[model samples]
Target chain A: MIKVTVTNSFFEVTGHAPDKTLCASVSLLTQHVANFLKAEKKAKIKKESGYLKVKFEELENCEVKVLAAMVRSLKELEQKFPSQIRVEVIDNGS
Target chain B: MIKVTVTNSFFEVTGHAPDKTLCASVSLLTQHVANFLKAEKKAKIKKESGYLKVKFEELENCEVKVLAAMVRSLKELEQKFPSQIRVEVID
Candidate 1:
């Protein structure tokens, strides 16, 4: 499995959002994914509030489904908070 | 070796700062480190313009030196652009 760590930030969408309300959603998203992965395939996902670290097993490549989910989440974040594309996979080495 | 992907953003950062100038400096720092890692003990790092992805072989654990370097670079950026800690490791 191609393990990729994810980290991100929430910006001045309406003058910097409330950490618990806005930033917490981001954390919730990660936790939701982590819990989903764990419950579904017993995937061991460990992360802090700052970074989301995923350790996939057996799979040796990236999956479009998961990436799409992540992108959707990111888009939702921007949509909800007036955020923009700061850093994405397309930003660095593709 | 722990393969970690690092992602961040540049903001009002003095009105988004100069994309090429400020952003490029961040990119250049990644490349500089990437090249240094590659030339010594053979490491592979491939990145684009948005995020910095690192793949390592035969090593485990995050190094304080590299993290400090990244922080130092980021601090320099904020200093240069009037940025602040919207997000640090703790942010």
Candidate 2:
């Protein structure tokens, strides 16, 4: 089984799950970071200090990564919501 | 309208939410304690001895405190998903 995890400081999703895998979800978010900022490098190391705006309406209780598939999904969320763009990733680590 | 709540260890629901109320949620949870443990009182003192075991899924982003207008909800969930049921009060 794929033991992935998605977590906040208080909430941690570890062990194996069918859909909410760690690799799958984080990859999805990575693209979100790239396209929201409209940066050249989609999967590179970047950080923001504060006032990181975000909209998590459609985001499920997940934090997973699935490699290449998500690089596309992030761009998808970015194009869909221009006003809700430029949100930062917090609650990392599982 | 009627409001209710169900909670867990890390998460809490307080203030006034449209659907989730502190009085209702905590009261329902209070029953779980009385029934599952079968205490002498249906309404009793809320405290901690040393540890508690709990279940399942759920939360929102609020801290609501309401008086008792309603005090009943589903707590078979504690028997069903005890792991997801958590204490929501105490500063």
Candidate 3:
């Protein structure tokens, strides 16, 4: 089962998905967001063999929209491939 | 003056350039590298209003090529816009 965890500062993806396309799609989209934030100097991002994490230090209005788009996309992925993926958003009382 | 710094684990860009195009080119290329590494889970990346950084934890052969391409491109940009940009790969 693929697991996605979202928080106030960071968002992470872990575990495996049955579908390779799903995994590729997730990786690409997440990376795009990571890169955009990096270019804007808004977050610190880390990635490993099965993990991708982006931690935000600052955010502009547009940057917030970019992240929101990722969350929405993840939710859609969860709905489309319910058997293979799970997404959770953790609110830290921000 | 634009500044580019490269290390074994990370690459960074700071400072300002007289030409907006030069700055945009640098930002886009560097961000592309950072994103690729991030997707491969090989590095840590950070960016700010005027800074971009990518820190690698692991690298595959292709990823290395991707980084090399950025370095080459930065050098070309430096040559093309010498008055506005400076490329420095810190050993």
Candidate 4:
């Protein structure tokens, strides 16, 4: 199961899989995004475990929507695998 | 069936899978290595078709062994999945 979290200035999208592909893909995407946007990609990708955490250190005003859209895109991608993506939001500001 | 090609002045490792994970993992490893080595990584990773190509532009004198070790590691990793990874060596 995959869980996506977007709370405050934090952005994280975690996914699980029967194989390692899903997590690995997420990390690749995150790396490219981080390089393109000059943002820090706080991601943990494991191939054997099929686990991924696509997290960002912090987002600027312009990047918020971008991150949100990323979450949606990931959600859509995981749909193809079925029962592999979930969104867990924590939008409350402390 | 996966293919591992190690030719002169070239390093390529490809992996196939029932799902997208194997290819994805290879690409991840390739990316990290490219960063660590400050070399160009030529990789094509797709999830739907379960195909990955971990190719390098040109290895330095010192980096050849590292890439070889990486290939061996991939072979071992696929062994765990059973029939999921086939080593087609173009050595």
Candidate 5:
């Protein structure tokens, strides 16, 4: 299983997952990053300051499901870290 | 309508909504915080440094519904911010 952790101070995604193994949101996100951002060297793990932003290309139906799963999982996390994390979605009218 | 914005570096809840006007997630979360956390000053807006944390007491059914709405709204926010914002729920 892939493991990923994102905090205001730290963001890290590690592990490799094949298509069938996209069973977990963490794994799915990792795979998406690897495919879209990593190949182009856009999503790199590095020491940084405030206001981090990540951009993604248009998502397919399956990818949208993965993203929604991640949103729900993050909601579960909010119980512990209330008010510390924020999430937002932008629709391109599609 | 109540407006709330939660960032990893900053957190805020504002505006007021009566029970009947609890229509949006922002309004709901603001109400929840005002009722459960703000009443006792457990939730306060302030300038702070790293590892910010907020605590709340047990939630009633109505409050739980409010929280769930906040979660969904935050999820919508995720499409824009991505990993910069880390959201985790403890049960």
Candidate 6:
């Protein structure tokens, strides 16, 4: 099972997928967001074997939109692979 | 070897990578772009076993920026996995 968690300050993806294709897809998407945050100097990122976490100091509207897009994409993936992928988005009331 | 071709109108990813991780990375990034185009109603997309193609009818600036970001990420991958990934951004 693949689990993805997103909040206002950070986002993380953990667990394993059924196959490498799905694993890689999740990795790339999250890594892309991490890379974007890193380039913008907005977050602290951690990457490990099948794990990714990003925490931002100050999130911008543009960055929020990017996160939204990531969440939307992951939701789409979850819909496609219902039993394999799970996504949780916490509002944090920001 | 993984080969990625990006043009103004469309982008295509072909060939295979050394491992599933790299291959999946390429696939996801390209697919994300394709999905974005699809949502925007801007492009025609094609998906096959290991091939993905997206051709835009009329490209917008915002979409172009997304493509640029994809190219940058692919280039970074090429750098990290030199000899395994090759990215070509045709001007």
TM-scores of all candidate predictions against the true structure: 0.32, 0.17, 0.50, 0.38, 0.27, 0.73
Tell me the TM-score for chain B of model 1.
0.50
| Per-residue lDDT of model 6, residues A1-94, tens digit only | 9999987778888999877778778877888878777766888998888788999877766566667788998998899899889999887654
Pick the lDDT winner: 6
Task: Provide the clash count, candidate 6.
Answer: 0
Interface RMSD of each: 14.7, 17.9, 13.1, 10.3, 15.9, 2.4
Pairs clashing within candidate 1: A1-A59, A91-B49, A91-B50, A92-B47, A92-B48, A92-B50, A92-B51, A93-B47, A93-B48
Q: How accurate is candidate 3 locally (lDDT)?
A: 0.73
Docking class of 2: incorrect
DockQ of 1: 0.02
What is each predicted model's overall lDDT from 0 to 1? 0.39, 0.27, 0.73, 0.49, 0.37, 0.81
Winner on DockQ (3 vs 5): 3
DockQ: which is higher, 2 or 6? 6
User: In model 1, where do residues sit more than 4 Å from their true spots?
Assistant: A1-19, A59-67, A82-87, A90-94, B1-91
lDDT by residue (tens digit), candidate 2, A1-94: 2211222211111222233222233222332332322222222332333212222222222211222223233344345443333222245446
Best by DockQ: 6
Q: Across residues B6-86, which tens digit of lDDT does each residue of candidate 5 receive?
A: 432334544433322222323323333344333444444342332223444554443343344445544543454453333
Judged by lDDT relative to the true structure, which candidate is superior, 5 or 6? 6
DockQ comparisons of all candidates to the true complex: 0.02, 0.01, 0.03, 0.16, 0.02, 0.46
User: Candidate 2, residues B1-91: lDDT per residue as tens digits?
Assistant: 2122433332223232232232333433333333322222212233333222332212122111101111112232233334444323223
> Residue A51's C-alpha lDDT in candidate 6?
84
RMSD of each: 17.7, 18.4, 15.1, 9.4, 18.1, 3.4
Chain A TM-scores, per candidate, are: 0.51, 0.23, 0.92, 0.55, 0.40, 0.91
Query: What TM-score number comes out for model 2?
Result: 0.17
Ranking by TM-score: 6, 3, 4, 1, 5, 2
Q: Which regions of candidate 4 fall more than 4 Å away from where they truly are? A: A13-15, A31-58, B1-91
| Ranking of all predicted structures according to lDDT, beginning with the best and ending with the worst | 6, 3, 4, 1, 5, 2
